[PDB]
Every structure is written in structure tokens, then in C-alpha cells.
Design a binder for this molecule. Structure first.
Ligand SMILES: [Mg+2]
Ligand SMILES: [Mg+2]
Ligand SMILES: [Mg+2]
Ligand SMILES: [Mg+2]
Ligand SMILES: [Mg+2]
Ligand SMILES: [Mg+2]
Ligand SMILES: [Mg+2]
Ligand SMILES: [Mg+2]
Ligand SMILES: [Mg+2]
Ligand SMILES: [Mg+2]
Ligand SMILES: [Mg+2]
Lengths: 109, 176, 148, 199, 50, 138, 135
RNA sequence: CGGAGCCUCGGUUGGCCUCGGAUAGCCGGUCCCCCGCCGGGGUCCGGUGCGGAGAGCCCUUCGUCCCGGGAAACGGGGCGGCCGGAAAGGGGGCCGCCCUCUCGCCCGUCACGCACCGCACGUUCGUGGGGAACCUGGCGCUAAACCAUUCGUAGACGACC
RNA sequence: UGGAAUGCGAGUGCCUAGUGGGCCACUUUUGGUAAGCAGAACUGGCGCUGCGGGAUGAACCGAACGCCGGGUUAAGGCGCC
């Protein structure tokens, strides 16, 4: 067993300077620091994974405190490897600067 | 005119529109250094207007075409005669450049005239461009490359890949 | 917009930003284009531009409505009396400025183009100044590809 | 986990900008030898800049700020604080992810220090330009522990030299060992050379 | 406007705040700088104002 | 202190640009920033090249400044620069890099096994050598 | 993804296990085998979008896969609960596992160290980024 | 100091245990020569687009079984002591032990394990932090602070002596 | 051969509120040393109007507004905030 996802940081939301578009998240991925290295990740699944107080069901498992908001990478962002991600619900602002998981599927290689 | 990108040399031929008095007006030609042809034709009408009782309405462009460099793979010294307006007058200058294409030497002129004199390209009128032999050059910066046994190192080679890696364990080396 | 420019832009039917129209050139129309020079980018379109414009963004003005030209019958019913009965006849009348350019062209609704993909240089100055306004001759085609 | 940086030979502002962004993205950063930091411009004009800063004080109660920290670590810390949204919870949390030190106290003395080539003076300054030392600057605006930091930094370097000599001793043995077992590891060495891990 | 006639301010701002001391027994804020060449000796003492 | 010089015939390694990874010879110097380089035997047309993208090697061909491509190729063959380059430690390190960059997932697994065993044999020997030197002191 | 290609499974209980591709079924799902004796993955269906195809291949050109191994063969059989109900490996499945494995396995062992590769599991580690490495 | 659990808080999903530094110069050997309390200088030899490379290194995990081949044998795992650490101090190495294994590593032979019938929150750090309790063994401890009273070196009251 | 181009459906009648302090900018312009001063012409603005940029701002630059998703832009920008 071992890790099967790439380490990403929830950098912030899509924004100008004084307007915030919370439906899109800007993700920084480890080792991706050019716009041309982001092509592998486009369309990949993203998962903000966290813990809460009340137990919740787990697919293929028994209830625990883990929770996840799913999303996927939609496009690159800027010249330095950032990608825009969209989630089934807008990410909470408390998650900025914290881990976002980037999966290896849907695989295109 | 905005000296956008590398300029090109254009050969522009125009004339007065034929009239009953003169059924065949004489033809005039100009060497135009411009970004594209649409600009090239515009500057032609600006120059011939200054020299002749002519303008776009009472004349036509007979030929606009790019003049290609004849020896793009050979080093040459260029002499450029130009006049420009400063904040407080008009001046004539003679400048020299070392390049492979005459249009490259002219592009160097605009970037250089902007750097050393804050001259925007709308104030610069390139009068003449000639290829000059090494014996006839006047500028010490150009003449020092007329040396058959030229040699020199590259001291203090600055690191240009300064964010790959952004954080590193070893300090860079400037000697090579 | 100054009163004279505003009237000339309505006569060209460019009542909205990034609206497009064909104009057949002559002393009457070239002098109108000079008045609205700061407000327009224009040039000479090639055959491919006329094709892609009318195919992707071609809408007829039928009964004062904007109808997508999804069928040849739409052209034939309105312009058939001038023997324009298919998209190719409509493209031919526009491109060659046929005898019925006026009718075939006014039949087309002003083309609603998108913002130029890749940006502009400077909308506030002429093309020859490194901007966008005025006559850029055949360079209009590069703009049309990025907006069509 | 924690990005440890060496403050020696780095330009104050450039390092802070990179360090400020790292802690906003959630990374823990430790900067050591803040007295080794450099500032472009001659020393005197940099001293004047801080003496002007010292004049800024609430005329009616100087105890109410601004507070003029004299340690090179705190001067750098306040510089990084100037590149953060430090009046929001997000900015203060980022500011808590940075630790700043004069010299190299434990446990960072026995850990590898990274540099930031984009903030290195040798990379960013023409060699003819003058520059200032944050340590000399700080010492001359009221910092009181320049001599002690140097005295303790002199003891650490003597210990580091002993450690290095031991590392060189162990590498000399390693190269000798690779020669003694050259026959027993030949097959495994071709695998590495085949795939570039050994040139 | 400027005050008509000059005069020194009353009191020294270097002794602020003018508050009750936190310590009843006077604290030695600075001992003499040690000189390693002198013989071992003490540098302070306590007495009572008779 | 300087050992390598921008001079006519100097062979440089192109590090970045359209021709990155190739060898060219300095045919002439245009100005402080550009040279006229030629790569007849390495598939580079005669052209202007900034000194920034170059890296001087130790080879120096002999031909007159601005000599046309026939004689630049001629000198390249005489000095056999292509084999001399590939025999340098500089060239070998480039090859070692791209072998490792193109390693397959299975190849990565085989290296881990070979590395794992080689690292154990060496470490065991180093322990014995450490013990050996201890007795000499004792 | 060509027959005999080694795929890395990304999801399910078998995630990270390297398996052997056999063929694509009529529904577009892939047929793979562990083989069961190397990584404990049986004749199993998997989705192509949820695997990473490596560059390592074996020639199973001469392997005869049974024609009754179809989508309907692998489709789950519903189990009714009124306690639970447990899936039971049918005897036909075990027979089919040996039929296919007995041919593929010798071909695996021809390639040196390949069997050990199929026993190992894929994982991402420090400094290893998927976009950089060839599979 | 040496058991089950129950609440609650979160984040995380291998480790790098270190010369000093120069940058118009560096790094490693060589000690054969000169100095010093094994280290410094010189000479000599090697590397220098750093390969004694952070563009790096270390670790690498499916488990077990049978029997072979390489590698170990100076070996792995497990209770007593001595050097060593203070800027914000080491669950490192080493000497003994009575023990405990020839399995750990690499390549093979031989089969097995819920093979849960395509699918998410998997995979550590984790005997994590904090809180109540319940045990269950051993070795240990039996204080102060504030009020009240008194003082007047203090004092609007508090405070202070 | 509805006799230039272009565009556009027009004509017409009753009843009618509020307003009748304005102010700002390019150009032109009177008085004044000048004024964020007083007085004019033209157009456009603010007033009545949000929105992106000019850190901040009635008027500047861009652009005008039903409630949304995706894409692209303007004027402006891209060390960090
Ligand atoms: Mg784009
Ligand atoms: Mg304007
Ligand atoms: Mg003080
Ligand atoms: Mg006075
Ligand atoms: Mg967890
Ligand atoms: Mg006024
Ligand atoms: Mg009002
Ligand atoms: Mg209005
Ligand atoms: Mg408005
Ligand atoms: Mg401003
Ligand atoms: Mg939008």
C-alpha cells in the first residue's frame, strides 16, 4: 500500500482583486510549476477530505468521521502550473492553504 | 508608427494620379522600415507629402513589397542617418550598428534611440541606411569587433533559471 | 458618442459593440467610414472570411425577426426574386458585390461577433499607430478569425 | 515538513516575498542567520532608512506604536509581515508558520539549510553595486547581541567542521568499499549505469 | 501660535511613569562590568537607613 | 583564471532555445551579445545566437572567421568533434540524465532492487573497514 | 492498452496492483488477471479509465482464453437479505482461473524479475510526480 | 513508573542527522615537504555546466510456504555500563549480557490466503492532543494561597510593607 | 429604368406631471496675478448610475445593469499584500 494521489494546495478562489467567484478553486499542485506541465492533470478528480464530529457512512466501509467534497480539474490557470478546479459544493474558506487530493483517474495515459 | 517587433524593409512605389495635364506622372520610390505593409504605405504618404505636393487622395501606391536581406548570413556594419525631435529641438544623427539584416540594424536603432534619448518612433525619421566597410566606421563600440583574432570570456555568468528549483541545497556558481 | 458618429454607426447598423457588417465601398461610404474611424475596425475580407462569417453567424432578417439560416428555403423565399436561393448564392452576391448586394446584405442581420480571442493591441488608437481602429486592409481577416 | 532557509547572502525584500507566499500556502518556514541578510544600496543610505523609521512614533504616546524592533530576526519578521494580510485570521495564521532566528540555534543547527537562488545577492545584484549587512545595520540601531551571536556562531562552526571531517572520512571509506566489493556488486552497477543512476 | 516667552518644561520625562515601584527593595539594574584581572570580590550590599 | 574564450572556432553547447542540446561552432562575433554560429555536422543552420543560450566547451576548431559552411564542416570532421564530445564526462552526464528520465515503471522497480542489494553489500564492507581502522589505533 | 500489457489498477480493493490485460469485453470493460498466484487478483473486469497502462508487455498472442468469459459471466448475481448473504467462488471460476493462468504464468516468468514486479504495489512517494515519469 | 475502552479536537498520508564559504573562482584526494594542538600551507593528481550532482541521496510494504543459488558469518533481534549534549542541552554511536535466530537482503523453484463477482472517505504520522471516568500493580508526598487580625517604611478604596 | 449611397414603417390629435438653484471634462473663449474664481460656445458627462481599472474619490479610463452556467475580452495589470 501507499499514496495514490498527488498533493495539491487550495490556494484560493477565482477572483479579480475585489470580486470573488467561489464556484471555482485555484489549486497548486506539487512539482507542477509551468503551464505546460498541467496537461496531465486536466480532468483529473479532486477531493477535499476532512473530518467532522458526527459519524457518516463510508462507501464500502462502516461509518466514521471522514468526509469529502469531490471535484475535478477543469483547466490550467496562469503560467506557473496552477489549475482551476470545480467541486460539487463550493469549498469552505477554512480550507485555504490545506491539502487537496488529486487522483490519478480518469486515466488518459 | 510604433516600432513593434522586428521591423521590415519595404519598397513602396507611388505616384500622382494621372490627369489630362500629365497623362503619365513620374514614379517615386521610398525605403520604408515598418512593422507591416499597412503601416509601410501609411508612412510613405507621410514622407512624400513632406517632399511633394502629393497625398493619399491625389495619388496611388503602385507597388508595396518587402525587400529581403541579400546576405542574411554575413556580418555587416550599418551606418544610419536619421533626424529626430527631442523635447526642445530637432537633430541629425549618424549611428552605426553591427547586424546581419538591414532591417535588424534599423530595429536596433529605434530601441537604441528610445533608450539613450527617450525618442518615440513617431519623432524619428530615418533618412538613409548604408552598409559600411570596417575601415569606414566611426563609432568605437562598433570598431572593436573588427579584430580577426577576437577573443573574450564570459565572466560572472548570472543564473537565469532562478525558480527551477526555487529552493535548493547548494548555492549557484557564476564561474564557467 | 458624439451625435454625428452616433448617427453614422446606426446607418451602418453597428448599434452594439463587436457587431459586424459588410459595406460596399464607394465615395459615399468610404467618407462615412472616416467619420466613425475611432469607433470601428474595418478592412477587406477574403473569400474564406465571407464563408465562415455567413455560415457560423449568418442570420436572416425575415419578417423583422432574427432567423438562423439553417435552411436554404429561408434564403429562397426572401431573396429568390433576385435569384438568390441558396447560401452559395448569398455568399456569391456578398463577395462579388453583385447587382443586388444591397438587398442580400441588408437581409443579413448584423453579425454578432465575440470578443477577440487573444485580446487587442489598443482600441483607442489607429491600426497604423499600433492600435485597432481604422482601416487595416486585409489584416481584418486575422481579426475575423479570432472573433468569428 | 518545515522549510529551513539560510539567511546569509539573501536580499531582505526578495526573501520576504518568497517566504511570505510560502507561509500563505500553508508551509512551515524557518529562517536562520537573519543577521546574514543583505540589503541593496550602500550601508549609510540603508542606515538612514531605518533612522527615519525610528522617527515614526505616536506623538501623543510613543508606547502605542509603531514598535521598532532592533534584532535582524525581528526586522526580517516585520518585513515578511508587511507582505501578508496580517489583520485577517488567514494572514495571522500564515505569520505563525514562520520562525526567525539570529544565528542557528538548535534544532536547526544540525539540519540542512536550503537557499533561495531568486533572493541570493550573488544572483540579483551586479557585483559593483554596494550593499548593507542586516547585522551591522541592526547593531547600529540598538541591537545588543551582535557580539554574543558571533561568539556562539563561532562555536557552532567549529563543531560543524568536525562533523564534516567525519563525513569526509566516511565517504573515503565508501569509495574504498566500492573498490573492495567491485566484483560482488558489478552486476548491480550495470543496472544503475544502464538506467542513468550512475554515469 | 508660538508661546510668547520660552521656558524649560517641568520635570523629566526620563523618569516616567511616575508610579508606585513594584519592588520595595531596590533592584540593581546594572552591575559593574567584570574585569577578569581583578581579585574575586563582591559588588553590592544591603543596609538600612538609620 | 578564465580558460574558455568566445573565439572563432570555439565549440559551444546550446542549452536552451530551439536548438537546445546541440553543438555549434562560433564562426564570427556580431556584437557583445550575439555570435554567428554554425552546426553543419549537428543540424544547425548558420545563424545568429545569443551568448546567453550557449556554453563554451573545450574544443577549438581552426578556420578563418566568417569562413563559409564548407570549411566549418571540413574542420569539424578533421577534429571528429562528434566522437570527442560523446567521450567527454559532460556528454556522458547528459546521457545519464535522459536514461533516467525515460525510465519505465518496470525499470524503476529493477533499479530499486539492484540499488537495494548494492547498497547493502557496500554498507557491510564499510562496517568491516571501520572495524579495521579501529584495531590499528588500538 | 494492447493484450498482454501490464496495467496498474487505481480503484477498488485491488488498487495499486499490477495486472495483465487479456482482452476487452463486448461492453468495453477490460478483462484482466492477476494472475491470482502473484497478486491475488483473479479473472476480473475493470474499466479502462481507471487504470494506468505501463510500457511493459508480454506476448500472450498464443494464449487461448475461453469464449464463455463474457460480460454476462462476470456480472454480479444479486443476493437477497430478509441475515446477510456471502459471495461464494463457484467451482467453474476456479477451473477457469487455472486454465488461463497455466498459460500466462510461464510467459510471465520468461521475463526476468517480472513476477516480482507483479507482486509489488504502485505508490507515489516523496518527489515523485505522475506527470514526470514514464509508465 | 507499569489495560480495555468512551468523548472531544483536528490536521497529515516516507526520511534526509548539519563544513565553512567563494562567485574575475570552486570541490575532492595526495601528506612525499614545511608548520601545530590527527588539523593548516605548499607541491602533485583528479573533477568543475557542480555526478563526492538537492537535476541529488537514503527507505521502499502484499504475507506466508517447500527447496536451490548468490550475499552474511567481523551477521540480525532482545538487558546492564562508559565518553558525549547548555543558544531553546541527545529514545545517537560504542563496551559487556545469559539470551534469541540462522528468516530477514537479491535471483529462482513450489503453492496457498475472502478471488467479496468494474467503482468513493483506501494507504501512515497513531499507543496523536485534550477531558472525564473505570480499573489493575509497584515506588513516593503529606502544602500553600487569599480573607480575617496586626503594621505604617504604604495608602482615596484596592494595593503595598 | 419611382431617376445618388446608406439605414429606417410613418403620420396625426387630445390630456398631461415634474422641472424652470445646476455642476464637471476635451477643444474654443471673456474678466482676473491667479483661484477647487466669475462668465460663455460645442459635444459628452455627473445630477438620475450601478459595474471593471485609476490604492482612496460625483465627473477620469473602460463599460452602462433582468436571475444564472461556460467561454473571451476592454481599460488596466501579473515580486508579496
Ligand atoms: Mg485564453
Ligand atoms: Mg477618449
Ligand atoms: Mg531603548
Ligand atoms: Mg519661540
Ligand atoms: Mg486520516
Ligand atoms: Mg465655471
Ligand atoms: Mg436635484
Ligand atoms: Mg440620462
Ligand atoms: Mg455612469
Ligand atoms: Mg492615484
Ligand atoms: Mg462570466
Amino acid at each position: 500500500s501507499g499514496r495514490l494521489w498527488c498533493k495539491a494546495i487550495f490556494a484560493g478562489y477565482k477572483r479579480g482583486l475585489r470580486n470573488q467567484r467561489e464556484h471555482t478553486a485555484l489549486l497548486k499542485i506539487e512539482g507542477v510549476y509551468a503551464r505546460d506541465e498541467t496537461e496531465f492533470y486536466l480532468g483529473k478528480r479532486c477531493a477535499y477530505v476532512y473530518k467532522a464530529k458526527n459519524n457518516t457512512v463510508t462507501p464500502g466501509g462502516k461509518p466514521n468521521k471522514t468526509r469529502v467534497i469531490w471535484g475535478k480539474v477543469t483547466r490550467a490557470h496562469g503560467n506557473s502550473g496552477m489549475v482551476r478546479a470545480k467541486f460539487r459544493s463550493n469549498l469552505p474558506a477554512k480550507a485555504i492553504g490545506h491539502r487537496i487530493r488529486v487522483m490519478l483517474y480518469p486515466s488518459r495515459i | 508608427m510604433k516600432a513593434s517587433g522586428t521591423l521590415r524593409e519595404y519598397k513602396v512605389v507611388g505616384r500622382c494620379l494621372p490627369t489630362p495635364k500629365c497623362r503619365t506622372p513620374p514614379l517615386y520610390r521610398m525605403r520604408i522600415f515598418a512593422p507591416n505593409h499597412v503601416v509601410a504605405k501609411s508612412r510613405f504618404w507621410y514622407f512624400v507629402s513632406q517632399l511633394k505636393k502629393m497625398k493619399k487622395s491625389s495619388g496611388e501606391i503602385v507597388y508595396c513589397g518587402q525587400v529581403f536581406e541579400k546576405s542574411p548570413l554575413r556580418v555587416k556594419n550599418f551606418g544610419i542617418w536619421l533626424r529626430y525631435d527631442s523635447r526642445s529641438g530637432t537633430h541629425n544623427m549618424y549611428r552605426e550598428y553591427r547586424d546581419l539584416t538591414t532591417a535588424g540594424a534599423v530595429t536596433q536603432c529605434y530601441r537604441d534611440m528610445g533608450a539613450r534619448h527617450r525618442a518615440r518612433a513617431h519623432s524619428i525619421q530615418i533618412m538613409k541606411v548604408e552598409e559600411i566597410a570596417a575601415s569606414k566606421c566611426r563609432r568605437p563600440a562598433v570598431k572593436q569587433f573588427h579584430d580577426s583574432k577576437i577573443k573574450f570570456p564570459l565572466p560572472h555568468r548570472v543564473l537565469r533559471r532562478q525558480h527551477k528549483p526555487r529552493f535548493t541545497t547548494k548555492r549557484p556558481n557564476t564561474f564557467f | 458618442v458624439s451625435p454625428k458618429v452616433r448617427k453614422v454607426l446606426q446607418l451602418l447598423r453597428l448599434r452594439q459593440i463587436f457587431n459586424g457588417t459588410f459595406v460596399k465601398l464607394n465615395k459615399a461610404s468610404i467618407n462615412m467610414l472616416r467619420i466613425v474611424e475611432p469607433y470601428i475596425a474595418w478592412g477587406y475580407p477574403n473569400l474564406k472570411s465571407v464563408n465562415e462569417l455567413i455560415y457560423k453567424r449568418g442570420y436572416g432578417k425575415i419578417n423583422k425577426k432574427r432567423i438562423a439560416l439553417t435552411d436554404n428555403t429561408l434564403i429562397a423565399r426572401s431573396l429568390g426574386k433576385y435569384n438568390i436561393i441558396c447560401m452559395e448564392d448569398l455568399i456569391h452576391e456578398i463577395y462579388t458585390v453583385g447587382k443586388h448586394f444591397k438587398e442580400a446584405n441588408n437581409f443579413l442581420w448584423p453579425f454578432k461577433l465575440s470578443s477577440p480571442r487573444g485580446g487587442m493591441k489598443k482600441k483607442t488608437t489607429h491600426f497604423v499607430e499600433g492600435g485597432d481602429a481604422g482601416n487595416r486592409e486585409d489584416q481584418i481577416n486575422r481579426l475575423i478569425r479570432r472573433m468569428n | 515538513q518545515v522549510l529551513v532557509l539560510d539567511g546569509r547572502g539573501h536580499l531582505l525584500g526578495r526573501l520576504a516575498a518568497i517566504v511570505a507566499k510560502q507561509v500563505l500556502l500553508g508551509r512551515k518556514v524557518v529562517v536562520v542567520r537573519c543577521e546574514g541578510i543583505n540589503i541593496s544600496g550602500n550601508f549609510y543610505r540603508n542606515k538612514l532608512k531605518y533612522l527615519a523609521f525610528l522617527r515614526k512614533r505616536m506623538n501623543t504616546n510613543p508606547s502605542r506604536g509603531p514598535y521598532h524592533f532592533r534584532a535582524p530576526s525581528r526586522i526580517f519578521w516585520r518585513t515578511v509581515r508587511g507582505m501578508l494580510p496580517h489583520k485577517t485570521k488567514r494572514g495571522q495564521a500564515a505569520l505563525d508558520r514562520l520562525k526567525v532566528f539570529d544565528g542557528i540555534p538548535p534544532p536547526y543547527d544540525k539540519k540542512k539549510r536550503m537557499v533561495v537562488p531568486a533572493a541570493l545577492k550573488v544572483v540579483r545584484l551586479k557585483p559593483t553595486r554596494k550593499f548593507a549587512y542586516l547585522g551591522r545595520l541592526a547593531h547600529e540601531v540598538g541591537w545588543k547581541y551582535q557580539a554574543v551571536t558571533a561568539t556562539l556562531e563561532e562555536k557552532r562552526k567549529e563543531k560543524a567542521k568536525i562533523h564534516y571531517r567525519k563525513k569526509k572520512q566516511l565517504m573515503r571509506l565508501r569509495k574504498q568499499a566500492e573498490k573492495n566489493v567491485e566484483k560482488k556488486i558489478s552486476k548491480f552497477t550495470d543496472v544503475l549505469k544502464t538506467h542513468g543512476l550512475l554515469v | 501660535s508660538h508661546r510668547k516667552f520660552s521656558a524649560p518644561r517641568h520635570g523629566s520625562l526620563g523618569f516616567l511613569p511616575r508610579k508606585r515601584s513594584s519592588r520595595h527593595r531596590g533592584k540593581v539594574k546594572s552591575f559593574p562590568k567584570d574585569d577578569p584581572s581583578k581579585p574575586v570580590h563582591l559588588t553590592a550590599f544591603l543596609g538600612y537607613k538609620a | 583564471v578564465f580558460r574558455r574564450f568566445v573565439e572563432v572556432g570555439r565549440v559551444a553547447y546550446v542549452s536552451f532555445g530551439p536548438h537546445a542540446g546541440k553543438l555549434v561552432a562560433i564562426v564570427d562575433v556580431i556584437d557583445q551579445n550575439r555570435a554567428l554560429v554554425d552546426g553543419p555536422c549537428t543540424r544547425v543552420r548558420r545563424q545568429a545566437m545569443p551568448f546567453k543560450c550557449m556554453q563554451l566547451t573545450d574544443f577549438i576548431l581552426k578556420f578563418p572567421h566568417s569562413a563559409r559552411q564548407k570549411y566549418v564542416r571540413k574542420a569539424w570532421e578533421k577534429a571528429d568533434i562528434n566522437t570527442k564530445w560523446a567521450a567527454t564526462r559532460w556528454a556522458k552526464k547528459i546521457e545519464a540524465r535522459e536514461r533516467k528520465a525515460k525510465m519505465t515503471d518496470f525499470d524503476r522497480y529493477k533499479v530499486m532492487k539492484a540499488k537495494k542489494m548494492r547498497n547493502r553489500i557496500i554498507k557491510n564492507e564499510v562496517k568491516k573497514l571501520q572495524r579495521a581502522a579501529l584495531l590499528k589505533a588500538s | 492498452i494492447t493484450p498482454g500489457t501490464i496495467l496498474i489498477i487505481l480503484t477498488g480493493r485491488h488498487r495499486g496492483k499490477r495486472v495483465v490485460f487479456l482482452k476487452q469485453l463486448s461492453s468495453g470493460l477490460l478483462l484482466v488477471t492477476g494472475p491470482l498466484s502473484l497478486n491475488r487478483v483473479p479473472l476480473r473486469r475493470t474499466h479502462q479509465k481507471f487504470v494506468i497502462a505501463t510500457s511493459t508487455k508480454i506476448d500472450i498472442s498464443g494464449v487461448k482464453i475461453p469464449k464463455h468469459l463474457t460480460d454476462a459471466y462476470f456480472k454480479k448475481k444479486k443476493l437477497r437479505k430478509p441475515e446477510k448473504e456471502k459471495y461464494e467462488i463457484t467451482e467453474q471460476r476456479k477451473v477457469d482461473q487455472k486454465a488461463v493462468d497455466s498459460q500466462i504464468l510461464p510467459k510471465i516468468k520468461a521475463v526476468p524479475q517480472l513476477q516480482g514486479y507483479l507482486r509489488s504495489v504502485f505508490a507515489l512517494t516523496n518527489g515523485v510526480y505522475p506527470h514526470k515519469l514514464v509508465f
